[PDB]
Each structure stands twice: as structure tokens, then as C-alpha cells.
Design a protein around this ligand. Structure first.
Ligand code: NAI
Ligand code: NAI
Ligand code: NAI
Ligand code: NAI
Ligand code: ADY
Ligand code: ADY
Ligand code: ADY
Ligand code: ADY
Lengths: 430, 430, 430, 430
């Protein structure tokens, strides 16, 4: 009746597995959570449904969750983010995976629907990225809200919607803001994008960054990381923002801050990092230099008005998967990446292992908090314990040969902190 | 009986005044506070006692406070930080200033004591930087605690002590953590030091940064700013930390993290940014390469064990004010800057105007909150309203020609934020 | 009898063609050479044999040479550098191309041999990269030296051998050092590598650069570019050199300079940019951290002793084309890229179009000088006219929206240079 | 009759001496030339007249020359570059020095004239920086050209004039282009300015670099160094050039290149590095944002039309020595630094010791070549032997703990270079 799993080519298992193994060596935190909670199986009895890009980095997550006693059913939260060799490794491993690269919007839904019912019954835990899973249930299958003990949100856009649902009393189950974890936002969002953005642009366009003008919308952690990447390759980065502080920041870094209306005329590479709609409109496409490269790294695909291009370009020619060159009426051409979808995951392989390890460690910690200490998490949206947070960072120091210092009784006194204990207040922003 | 003011040479007034005027053009926020509250005189009735480095930047602060109706009596919170031409300008302006560059520790106290009693009676407000003023009274003149309505703390070390006093029930008056203001910590502590540290080292030693090895203790905002400075000139930066997160950060930036015990052997320039004691000991001085330059930018002078040097060096020769070259017993020489005291303010001119403007604006806002809305500030230590915070940033965007963007009703809707109102949650760390 | 061309899959033409067209838009110089010398056909009568990585960038070169009246027969100077879609586009265009990705060393020779005889007879012009073509003939087919009018050398290693052949009186035909062209060495070697090195590492390993230790051997233009790339991602770069100046340079940039003997113990990514043998030996592989990534970007494959690995590792497992993971006896694993071959071209797509345009324009200019002004080029090795050099740079300013300034008669006088003419002496190093 | 020496305050000797000693420790090459040729006194019989900024770094040069047997008479080649404590140290040392800070253009000449006649008769050697000395004699005292054995030129502007004199057969004595020395142009011109420019701007204005727009005219080594400095502090750098290559360079680094005519409207700090006249005119001053800071780091003072300001401003108010604030007619103010003169030397202390040691070493080597091997240097302008050049770099590696690598007989063979000998061709540009 139901399918055991759904993937592109399970014959990609062997290669995926090699990829997973190589990656495991790069994710200290994840492997540390394994070496510590494999026997106790803290996630015993858990039936987790997760909506996250099925990548090699995600397979190591899923496997770590299964190692901790959980039962998992997975789906990608992106139609192009899946890494078919990593997905055929999780299926063969015997885990039910319904994901492949290039699913029609319609299949994207069916895949999530498969992960809603397990052997022993429906899900009782949600691991989300983007918000699609926690919303599909809240609005389509509300009868399951009662059997779900918690929610784990990976990205900014997802967490923004949680705070919203709660604001309008729509959130019926507890959730942990995993994104806002210092070791998540300041490392995954910032450093991950600094490396994985260009990987997406390059692999798809093979364009030269040096000498070009790059326009980045939004100066959040993702923006700061994308800007520093481009700018560090010889590109001239212009930044657009709606926030005074963030903007004063881009300015105090040498970046020129102005409106997209004025910038669209100068840039060659446009990257949207803001988490809101209508960042790049037809009114802009009409001013862009020939063959401008437009991509978006925010979570969803409405920052760039693709429909406009689709309904206003003389012709569209697909160069290769997730790379289209449009011919406007003024003759210029617009190279669109991943149909306005996430560029790093759509055209590249996403963030590198080491950084994803920080995020996924917070993700496993969260599931264990929600599924084992329900009391501390009443309906609403909470942060992961500062202690747990500082634990992720600490668990990655050894791989990098980092040598922390130690206070002396005398020092620990001076400050008033614990020579071996915490000293950082929660006002600390890092 | 009592003195009207005490400064080095009041004949420096004319030059100071020009300095102040040139600076006023660089401090938008301060001038904006003047152009908005000069008639209402919100600080009317206030008798402020401030302990802050008497600099040109501070003169523009004091004058702004007087412009808002306040009565002010000043003193520097450092024996070497004073800028005699700016102090002789405030004195001539008719404001009682008791400060000069190079006071004996004994004069340093008398100076603060002068600013405790005004014409109309004792102080009723405290503007502090470092914690000396709010402590001099809490422990030496407790009878005045009753007449003080509030406290304004400039720096980390000062705010750390406030949180401490409160912890042990020693704080008898309210205070506002000005340092932790995003537009203060992320701009003054980080960007100010990135520019003003080297200004201190250079003016004193004229040392070449490129090619050297620079060891920076502590990776807080000050540390990150100092590291990026040195590292940006061609120096090789090594970082020492006691915090996992901060350390994983230094690491993810290309910086080598290890202990001072190992690092003291490689470095040429040592800069302590940590806010605790015994960061550099004699056990280290004995391993430092010849003519190593040691300086401290943290707030107080015990990070570097100067006493050791003083009691263990074969000889000490003063090159010029605040620059000493010591001859150890192994023959090497150790160039000490400002006797372990703040290097940027002792050997240079402190942070540049534009950045101090952000900090001092928060400082003026604070005084107005404490002296006008006492109800909102019960004994303890509070942050300055996020709204007031984001107001400092916003008031400096024009001078930098920064063009903010504006959401459309449609967008403001999408997000759920106010097209013209705030959208940043307090979890935001920036 | 003889084959018309030899490629992998000529059905890749359509895709290649699109790639070529997109690239043409990025190579101003090349297209400018076409729009100026297509009618005159200055290369009329020319029968060029070229040994250069058959890439999309190289197809635009070949086609430009045919546009100028030349007759071309091509071959790749690397067994892994070929770009099969770009090669099937040149074959379809009707140009004899003998090249594919992954040829056996034996086929690599047959391929070059095919390009030695044209319809109208043997070659009369040599376009080389690496030195293999001008050496195959000088040593294997010396009877052809008489019919060859000149030589064009693309890379440092190739040009180093020319100066050598000449030194021992082995060079029987004139050659132009194209590499040493300012617009070639300072743009292709430095900026090209700064972008294309990591493209190779990433595409193959997908490794995270931030937080790692990268060892780069040699601080030439290639070294400087690779160091800045890595270092710019958050990696810690150590450099090894044999030259005082170059080393003092790395040092004055914050880079630690030491021997490979000491560094092999700390690095995670090893990149050889030196153009000499035995840079990385077994004695090193035995000290590298687990899963260390080793790659070479110099021109030939003997910088890294791959034979040792091949003859001393417990086992070798191929992850995917041009990516091997070795199991040493101490248990550590060594991920070797492209079998010690050129990493950017073996695992990625090489330098980006725009930069290659500079180098290839110098390459076309050179053929025109050799084939049209033989007099000015007597047997030996010459530089390309500074005028022609400064012409490449000039021809790319427009695409970048660069606005040069113009001296006034008054200024042109002051300096003594020509208001519209050259003013840069040949001592200028840039 | 004649004066023994002329300085500001010889009581500054003691302090200067300490300065000299601290500096000597930073100049390895200079001290190495002393430890090797002090006994042989290769400059015995020499009567050197030098026109170079009398700085602490220059005293170590002069003393090194005297240590090698030379007789010296000095003068500053700038009216504001002199460092009075370093000059009063050379005078006390018993060396005739005629230089102070702030001499009238008239005294500037008298000072040079003093250094033309020694005890044993007139000069026989010229050490110049700028060209004033070799020109004062070639045009005012041609009778001495016969007794001068050689010329040493420090800076680009000076060397450009030599090549000129020669071009019009005006040069009557041999000269060595010291500037063009790789270890001079690529270290002093580029790295020295990257550190000493801002030292000049900061000490005089104390302006904040972050957030500002900085316009640099000319992308030579000086330009590249200044741009990287400002840009590295958070400023936005625009560049103007007249050369295609240099310009394509600035572009490939992320810098916006345009005309001063368009840029004068955006910048806040203007820095001329070009070696030509009329870079900044009144037509520009009339468009600059209020309180714009204008300075020039080129060698002479005509890059900025100061006369215009002087003849067109409503008023000029001197803030402090070498700092003037002008009031234009449109109301804006223009802060001029050092009256258009060299900013790093006029408002700061010039390049740091370690870098000056490279240039001054080349300067000593040159004097020894000219005065001892006159044969190898016929009338004209020559470069210093590459061997001697590579010897400066080499002599500074130890202070920086740089560990060079050593080829093996096997490698030395492979390349064809000498395992212990040179391998770098003269085409190398670095
Ligand atoms: N593909 C990936 O690897 C990753 C994607 N993300 C996604 O990126 C987005 C942003 O993440 P963060 O940097 O953490 O968000 P953020 O909230 O820190 O920053 C986005 C910034 O955009 C600004 N902004 C909003 N509307 C704007 C407009 N119309 N024009 C200009 N600026 C505007 C906001 O003020 C804000 O500062 C989210 O949707 C998140 O899900 C986050 C991390 C990784
Ligand atoms: N002179 C100036 O212009 C300024 C001075 N300051 C002063 O600098 C100090 C630090 O300020 P922030 O960066 O805001 O503080 P911070 O608290 O953010 O960072 C100091 C860092 O040092 C680390 N640390 C503590 N003890 C250590 C030890 N023994 N070894 C290594 N690392 C250690 C701490 O974990 C912390 O991350 C304070 O005393 C503050 O008052 C702050 C701003 C400007
Ligand atoms: N794959 C590519 O895209 C490109 C490859 N190349 C190749 O890269 C190589 C180097 O090119 P360039 O930077 O122009 O050469 P280069 O001669 O400027 O620099 C190589 C440096 O290595 C140093 N070196 C030599 N032997 C060494 C050793 N045993 N240990 C440490 N350092 C050592 C040399 O002193 C020299 O400074 C050449 O073989 C060239 O063909 C050049 C340009 C692009
Ligand atoms: N104050 C100091 O410490 C030092 C000063 N200098 C001086 O700086 C000047 C330049 O030195 P280098 O960088 O070695 O010279 P350079 O010749 O390498 O570069 C100057 C650049 O200016 C460009 N240029 C000329 N006229 C121009 C104009 N009207 N607009 C825009 N660009 C223009 C030229 O094409 C050239 O690339 C010389 O006068 C030299 O004496 C050199 C070294 C140190
Ligand atoms: N390789 C990857 N595997 C899984 N999630 C990823 C990867 N790269 C980026 N992400 C996440 O993508 C979301 C936004 O969908 C994040 O919050 C990132 O942490
Ligand atoms: N020029 C200056 N004037 C006043 N305070 C300053 C200056 N430079 C730095 N500071 C402050 O010094 C303290 C630490 O004493 C801070 O928190 C900085 O904001
Ligand atoms: N895509 C490419 N096509 C052709 N040659 C290239 C490419 N990328 C790098 N090269 C050249 O590779 C040599 C060394 O083989 C160079 O000198 C570079 O200019
Ligand atoms: N402190 C200094 N002492 C002597 N010459 C210097 C100093 N700083 C810069 N210069 C030189 O100034 C010229 C241009 O006048 C140079 O070529 C620099 O090498």
C-alpha cells in the first residue's frame, strides 16, 4: 500500500556511504552525541518526522538520531536541495526516505505526507527547516497536533513563523528556536554562506567574481557572510537594508548601502539574503547589465519575481539543470539560478560538513530536550539552554587544535565566575 | 576654599576649542541630542558627576549635557587618558574640570572628590566609566547614595561590577548598562579599538606591524577589533581565550588559539583585551623575544604584572612619556606601554569621534531616562530601551550617506512587522 | 587513414556551444581581436599546432585564431583538463580536435602527434602551454623545426624550459614568453588561481575551508593567489619558500613561513604551487593529520610524490573521478586530488573566462607577431611588446565599467609623458 | 664663518639617542652592513652630501655610513619631514646636520648649500631623495659635477627625473636607481605607506576611517598600499588612474575606478599618490562634502592646488601645526594636511624602521658600488645588482623568524638552478 521509501537511484548508495563516512570525520559534535547517547538511547520511543534538505550532512544527522534510539522518516524541504547519493544511502540503510533532486511541487508534498505515519502509529516529534512540516500539520492535519511532543526549527524563516503562529495563538505544540543558537546563527548562517554561496554561483555559472559588482539584499548573518565572500574575491559589494543598525554596520565595513532601485543599474551578481518578498522586480530586471547573474539564498523562492521574467522575457533557454538564461525585450540576458530557489543548495552542495555539525548538534540536543523534559517546554517557542549551546562550540575545539585557557582560583575569584564554570551573561551577543 | 577647576594649562583652550568644533562635526548623534532637547532642557535640575577620560570627545558630551540643562562636574577615569587641550576648553567654558594628563594615583582621587558637591548641594546623578565613581560613593560616602537618582556605566568592566554589587546586595541606586547597547558594544568596543589600538602602539613605538607576531588575550568585541587590526597590517595574530564559543570564533577566522604560556615565546606585540588579572606574568616576560612590545587595552592596569618587571628587571629607562624599555636579566629588552594602562588612551587619543558619538549618545539618552522616568528604573542594572538604542544607529546614517530601504504595505504585511515600525526581536545579537 | 578529430562524445556539442557563447560575452579581448582582424586575416597561411587544456575558454581562443585566417589542429596539455562539451563543439565546428577528459598517458601523446601534419603540409606555428609540444618536436621530430616560424608559451614552467633550451643551445625556433606578460602573470596566475583553486578543492572534496590549516608551497603569483583565497575563507595559511624576497613578502602579509618538514604536521590542506619536484614526500605523508587533503596546482605532476603513496599505502579507494582516499599504515587517510595533477583544471573548470581572456589575447597577439614580423624575433625567447601588453588590459576596462582619467597638456608636460601616449618605464613591476 | 650644524634644539639629543637605539634594533640590514664593513671602511675617502628626511631612521643610515668610513653632511628633503630629536642626536654625534621641522622654503635651500663643502673640499658623492640635490648642483653649481663620483636616488619622482636628465643629455654623473629595487619599491613604497599614511591622517585629524569614502589617485605601489590601508579599516575606496593595467588591477581587487571629476563628489578623504600635477583642483574642492580631508603622499606638493584654496577660501584657520581648516564660499570646510606636502612624514613619523631598513640598506650598498667600482657605472642611471638586491631581503629574514627552504642536489638539478645559488630571472616582477 504505502511506499517503504522513495528516491532517485538507490544504486548511488555505495558512493553516498563513502561520502557519509568522509563527512562523519568532519562532524565532531554529531559523532560525540553518538558516542555519548547511543546506549542510553534517549530518543527511545520517538517517531520523528523531519523536513530538511536531504544531504550527506543530513544523513549523518538522521543516522545519529537513529543511533540514539529514534525512529525516523525523512523528506527534503527543497525540491532541488536533495543529494541523491546521500538519499540512496539512507534508504538502503533501511530508513524510509522520500526525496530526490528535482521534484515537482506536487511530489514535494506527497513526500512530506509519507513521513507522517509510522509503524507504531503517527509522528510524535517534528524536526523542521523552513516551517513546511509544522504548518502542513497545523493547517491540514490538526488531529495530529495532540500526538506531537515538540518541534525543532532549523532556519530563520521557520523560526519567524513560529513566533508568528504563537502571536496569533496558532501554535499548538512546543518548539525550540535552533537557528537563534549562537553556535548556529553565528557559524552556520554566517560562515556557512561565506563558503557555500559562491560554490553555488561558480558551479552553475563558472563566472569570475573578481572585478564584478555584487549586490546583496539584507545584512543579517547570511548577508554579512555573502558580502565578505564576494568582496574577498575582488568584487565590489553594494548592500541594501531596511534596518538602521545593520546598515550602519555595512557602512562601517566599507560597503556602500543604497536601494535596489539605484543598485540594479550597477551590479552584475544579485544575491537576496533578506527573508521577505519582492526584493528584485521586473522594474529592476529592465535595468540590469547584460547577462546579470541573479540568485537568492534566503529560505523561500519569492524574493526574486521569477514569474515576471517567466511572463515577460522574449525567450528562456536552459543552459543546464537549475540554470536559465533569459532574453529580455531590451536584448540583455538574465542568468537565473535555481529558479529563484536556494542557490547554495540548489546549484551546489550546501554548507560544508564541519559547520553543519554545529547546527545539527543543536538539532539533536533539542529533540532530546523536548522528548525527555517536556515540562521545561510548555507550548510556545524557546531557546536551547545556553549550557547546551556552549557545548556544541566546545565539542568542535579539538578537531581544530584549539587550546582553551584556564582561569586560576585567583582569577576565577577576581571575576566572580567559576574557574571551571560559565561566566558569559545572556546579554552577550557575540 | 574649594577649587573652581583644576587642569594643566588653561592656555590650551583656544586649540582645544578648535578641536572640539572639528569633532562636533563628526558626532551626529550628540549634536542631534542638542538640537532636540536644548529648549526643553530635560536634564534641568540635574547635578551630574562624571568619571570619564577627559577627551575632546568627552567635552562634546559634557557640553551637550549642559546644553540639555544639566549642571556638570568632571574628572577623568584614567591618569594618562586626559587630553589637556580639551580639558582647558571645558574649564574656560566655565565648567568645573579637575583633570590633567599624568596625575599621581593620589591626585586621581582628589579630582573625583571635587566633583561630589555642587553649588546647590551634592550630586544627584552619576555618569561613570570603569566603576570608580559609583564605588567611591558606595564605599566611602554612603550618605550620598540617597541623593543620587541613577547611574550610567560606560564600559564592560564597569558594568560587570554593577551586576556584581547587585548580586551581593551592594547596589543602592539604579544604573543603566550603556556598554551592552548594540550601538555601543558593536561599534565602540569593536570598531573603535580596531582603529585606536594601533594608534597607541604606533605613536609610542613607531613599530612596524607587518611581519610581526601579535598575541591578543581575549576575543571579546575589543579582542576581535584588535585582532583584525593587527592582522590587517600583515602581523600574525595568535589568540588566547577561556571561552569555547569565542575561541571557536577566533579559530573559524584563521586565528591560532592557544595559551599565553606557549604563545609568549612567539609574539612580538602582546595586547591584553581580557578584563581580568594576571594575563601576562614574569614567567612569560622571561620567554619573550628581544624588545617585545607589551600593552593592555582592557580597562584596568593589572592584566600585565608590571610590579614584577619593576621588581625584577636589571634596569628601566624611560624612552619618552608612557614608554619604558626594561632590561631583563637574560639580556632581552621589554618595551612597556603606559605602565600597563590603557594603551589607546594613554599613548594615543582614544577612539575616533564618529564612534564615540554612538556611545555618548546612549550616555545622554540614559541620563534622561534615569532623571526623568525614575519609575521605570528600580534599583538594579538595566539596558537602554531597544528603541532608544536603534535611535543612535539611525541618527548616524545620514553623515555616512547611508540610504535605508522602505518596506511596502505588502511587505510589512508579509513579515508582520510595521512598514515604518520595529521588526527586530530582542534575541537578535548582531 | 588519419583521423579527422578525436573526442569523447560529439553529442555534447549543443551544450558546449551555449557554453562557448556565454563565455564569449566574458572575453572582451578575444572578441575585440576578432572584430579587428577577421577581414585582414593576419594569420592567413598559418598552420598552428597547439597544446593547451581544451576548455570552453580555449575554444573561444581557437575560434578566434580561425577567424583571423589561421588553420588549427588542437590537443590538450593535460589528461584531465579537457572539457568534453567544449571539445565536441570545436570538433563539430569542423576543427580537428583530439582531446578528452581522462586519457591514458599513451593517448596523451598520440593526440599531440595528430596535430603535427595539416592538409597543406606540417605545422609552421606552435601554441604551447607546459612545453610538451615544442619539446616533442625538438627531440622527436627535429626535421620539422625548419618549417616552424615561432613559438607561443603559456605558462611559467613552459617558459622556464625555453630559457633553458636556449641556454644549452637547444632552441631552434623563436618563442614569445606569453606568461611573463604583466596582464598574464599578474592576472591569470594570481587572480585566476585565487578563484579556481578552491573551485577544484571544493568540487572534489566539498571540504570546509574555514578553521583549517592550509600549507602552500611557493609564494609566486600562483602562491600569493592561493594563499589569499584560502586565508580569505577562514583558513590558517602557512607558506614555505626558497627565495628571501618572496618569503619576506609572505611574512609581511601575516603568513607564517617555515619548512614543509615542520608544517606537514599542522596542515589539513596542502597545495603545491612551486614548479619543482619533491615538495611533498612520504616522510611527510606519515605526519599529516587524518584525512589531509593534498593537491598540486603547479604545472606538472611531480611536486607530490604520488608513487610513494601508491607504493606505501595499505589501500587506495577511489571516491569519484580524480579523488582518491588512501589508507596509510599509521591508520590516517590521505585524500589525493587528481593524482597530483593540476587541481583547478583536473577537479574543476580552470580559471574563469574573463581572466583567461587576458592571457589568450596575449596569445593571439603573439602568433601575429611571430607569423608576421619574423624579423623582430630571431631564435631565442622574447617578451611581447609592452604596447601590446598594455593593450590587453586596456581592452577589458569597458566590460568592468572602468573610467580611465586623462592627463591635460599641462600634466603630460609636467611628467614629460604623452598626454595620450605611454608613461610607464620597463622597470615597472606592478 | 660657516656653521658647524643647524638644528632646532640640540637638547633633544638624549631622547633622540634612545630613539636611535630602539630603531637600530629594528633595522637588521643597516646593522649588518655595519658589522661587516666597519673595519674595511669601504667608504673611506668619501664625502657624502645627502638630501633625505632627517628622521630617526635616517640617523641610523648616516651613522652606518660614517661607520663605513664616510664623511657626511646632511639636510632634509622636506621642510616638515625632519624629526628634531633625531637631528639633534646626529649633530651631537658630531655630524654636521642642517635641518629642523618647519623651515621656510628659503631656509630649505640654505640648508642644502651647507652640505656642499667639506673640510677636505667639496662633495664627491650624492645621496638623494626627491632630486633636489642632484639638480641644485647640475643647474646652480655645475663646477662640482666633476668631483662627484656617483648619485643615489631614493624615490620614484627622483628616479623619473634622472631618466629625464639623461634623455636630454643633462646628467653629468652616474646614478643608481635605488627606488626600483624590488626590496625597495615592493616593501617601502607598498608596505611602508600601508602603515604610515593613516598614521599621518590620524595624528592630524584623528578622523574615523570606518564608514568613510576614500579617494586615492594613482594605483602604483604607493596607491595599492594606501588603498589597502583605508579599505582595511572599513572605508570605501575609489581609485582614479591613467594606466590600463594598473586600473584593471584596482578593478580586479574590488575597487571602483573613475575620474576625480566624478569622485570628488563622494569621497571624504582624498589621497594623491600619483607623481604628477593638478590631481585635485578648485573645480573639485567646490564639490567635496563638508570637512573633507585632503592630503598628498606623492613626493612633491603640487598634486593638490593649494594656491587655489589659499586664493579662494573665505577664511583659513590653523587647527594645529600642519593642519588647516578652510571655509569655502559654499559653506563647506576643507581640512588640508601639511599644506599639500607629504602627509606621512609631515603629520606623522614616516615609514616604520623595519621597512626603512630595506631601503637604506640598498642605499648603503649603492654608495659602495659607485665609490668603489666606478667602472661598472658609466654616466647614466643604473639598477642595483639583483644579487645585492636579494641580499637586503635575505638580511631581514632572521628578525622575522623566517625559515627558508633548501633545494636538494636533486632539485637544484631538476630546475637547473644552483642549490645554493640564484634561480630568479630578471623578468620576475614580484
Ligand atoms: N540557504 C542557506 O544556507 C541559509 C539560508 N538562511 C535563510 O536566509 C534568510 C535570512 O537569514 P538571516 O541572515 O539569519 O536573517 P536576518 O533576519 O538576520 O537578516 C535578513 C535581513 O534582511 C533585512 N531585510 C528585510 N527585508 C529587506 C528588504 N526588502 N530589503 C533589504 N533588506 C531587507 C532585514 O532587516 C534583516 O536584517 C532566512 O530566510 C533564512 O531561512 C539562513 C541560514 C542559511
Ligand atoms: N580602552 C578602550 O577603548 C576600551 C576598553 N574596554 C575594556 O576592555 C575589556 C574587555 O571588553 P569587552 O571586549 O567588551 O569584554 P569581553 O568580556 O567581551 O571579552 C573579554 C574576553 O576575555 C576572555 N578572557 C577572560 N579572562 C581571560 C584570560 N585569562 N585569558 C584569555 N581570555 C580571557 C573572556 O572570556 C572574554 O570573551 C573591559 O575591561 C572593558 O572595560 C572596552 C571597550 C573599549
Ligand atoms: N594551474 C594553473 O592555473 C596555473 C599554473 N601555473 C604553474 O604554477 C607554477 C608556478 O607558477 P608561478 O607562480 O608563476 O611560479 P613562480 O616561479 O613565480 O613561483 C613559484 C615559487 O616557488 C618557489 N619554490 C621553488 N621550489 C620551491 C620549493 N622546493 N619549496 C618552496 N618554494 C619553492 C620559487 O622560489 C618561486 O618563488 C608553474 O609550474 C606554472 O606553470 C601558473 C599559472 C596558472
Ligand atoms: N611619502 C612616502 O613615503 C613615499 C612617497 N613616494 C612618492 O609617491 C609617488 C608615486 O610613487 P609610486 O607608487 O612608486 O609611483 P608609480 O609611478 O608606481 O604610481 C603612480 C601612479 O599614478 C598614476 N597617475 C599619474 N598621473 C595620474 C593622474 N593624473 N591621475 C591618476 N593617476 C595618475 C600613474 O599611472 C602611476 O601608476 C612618487 O612621487 C614617489 O616619490 C614613494 C614611496 C614612498
Ligand atoms: N548541506 C546541508 N544540509 C542540511 N541543511 C543545510 C545544508 N546547508 C545548509 N543547510 C540549512 O539550510 C537551512 C535553510 O533552509 C539552514 O538553516 C541551513 O542550516
Ligand atoms: N576618546 C575617548 N573619550 C572618552 N571615552 C573614550 C574614548 N576612547 C575610548 N573611550 C572609552 O573608554 C572606555 C573604557 O574606559 C570605553 O568604554 C570607551 O568607550
Ligand atoms: N580554463 C582554462 N583554459 C585554458 N588554459 C587554462 C585554463 N585555466 C587555466 N589555464 C592555464 O593553465 C596554464 C598552466 O597549464 C596557465 O598558464 C593558465 O593560464
Ligand atoms: N622615516 C623616514 N626616513 C627617511 N625616508 C623616509 C621615511 N619614510 C619614508 N621615507 C622615504 O620618503 C621617500 C619619498 O620622499 C621615499 O622613497 C621613502 O622611502
Amino acid at each position: 500500500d504505502k511506499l517503504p521509501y522513495k528516491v532517485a537511484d538507490i544504486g548511488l548508495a555505495a558512493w553516498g556511504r563513502k561520502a557519509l563516512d568522509i563527512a562523519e570525520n568532519e562532524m565532531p559534535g554529531l559523532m560525540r552525541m553518538r558516542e555519548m547517547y547511543s546506549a542510553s538511547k534517549p530518543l527511545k520511543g520517538a517517531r520523528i518526522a523531519g523536513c530538511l534538505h536531504m544531504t550527506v550532512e543530513t544523513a549523518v544527522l538522521i543516522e545519529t538520531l537513529v543511533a540514539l534510539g529514534a525512529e525516523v522518516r525523512w523528506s527534503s524541504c527543497n525540491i532541488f536541495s536533495t543529494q541523491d547519493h546521500a538519499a540512496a544511502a539512507i534508504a538502503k540503510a533501511g530508513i524510509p526516505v522520500f526525496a530526490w533532486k528535482g521534484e515537482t511541487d506536487e511530489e514535494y508534498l506527497w513526500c512530506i505526507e509519507q513521513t507522517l505515519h509510522f509503524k507504531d502509529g503517527p509522528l510524535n516529534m517534528i524536526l523542521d527547516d523552513g516551517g513546511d512540516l509544522t504548518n502542513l500539520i497545523h493547517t491540514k492535519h490538526p488531529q495530529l497536533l495532540s500526538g506531537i511532543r515538540g518541534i525543532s526549527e532549523e532556519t530563520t524563516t521557520g523560526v519567524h513563523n513560529l513566533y508568528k503562529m504563537m502571536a496569533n495563538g496558532i501554535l499548538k505544540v512546543p518548539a525550540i528556536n535552533v537557528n537563534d543558537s549562537v553556535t548556529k546563527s553565528k557559524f552556520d548562517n554566517l560562515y556557512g554562506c561565506r563558503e557555500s554561496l559562491i560554490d553555488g554561483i561558480k558551479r552553475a555559472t563558472d563566472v569570475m567574481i573578481a572585478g564584478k559588482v555584487a549586490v546583496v539584499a539584507g545584512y543579517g548573518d547570511v548577508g554579512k557572510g555573502c558580502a565578505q565572500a564576494l568582496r574577498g574575491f575582488g568584487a565590489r559589494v553594494i548592500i541594501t537594508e531596511i534596518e538602521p543598525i545593520n546598515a550602519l554596520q555595512a557602512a562601517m565595513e566599507g560597503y556602500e548601502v543604497t536601494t535596489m532601485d539605484e543598485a540594479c543599474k550597477e551590479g552584475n551578481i544579485f544575491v537576496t539574503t533578506t527573508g521577505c518578498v519582492d526584493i528584485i522586480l521586473g522594474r529592476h530586471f529592465e535595468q540590469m547589465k547584460d547577462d546579470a547573474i541573479v540568485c537568492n539564498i534566503g529560505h523561500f523562492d519569492v524574493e526574486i519575481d521569477v514569474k515576471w521574467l517567466n511572463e515577460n522575457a522574449v525567450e528562456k533557454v536552459n543552459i543546464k539543470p537549475q540554470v536559465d538564461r533569459y532574453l529580455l525585450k531590451n536584448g540583455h540576458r538574465i542568468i537565473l539560478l535555481a529558479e529563484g530557489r536556494l542557490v547554495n543548495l540548489g546549484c551546489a552542495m550546501g554548507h560544508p560538513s564541519f559547520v553543519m555539525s554545529n547546527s545539527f548538534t543543536n538539532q539533536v540536543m533539542a529533540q532530546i530536550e523536548l522528548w525527555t523534559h517536556p515540562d521545561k517546554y510548555p507550548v510556545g517557542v524557546h531557546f536551547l539552554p545556553k549550557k547546551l549551546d556552549e557545548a556544541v562550540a566546545e565539542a568542535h575545539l579539538g578537531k581544530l587544535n584549539v587550546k582553551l585557557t584556564k582561569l586560576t582560583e585567583k582569577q576565577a575569584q577576581y571575576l566572580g565566575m567559576p574557574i571551571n564554570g560559565p561566566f558569559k551573561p545572556d546579554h552577550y551577543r557575540y
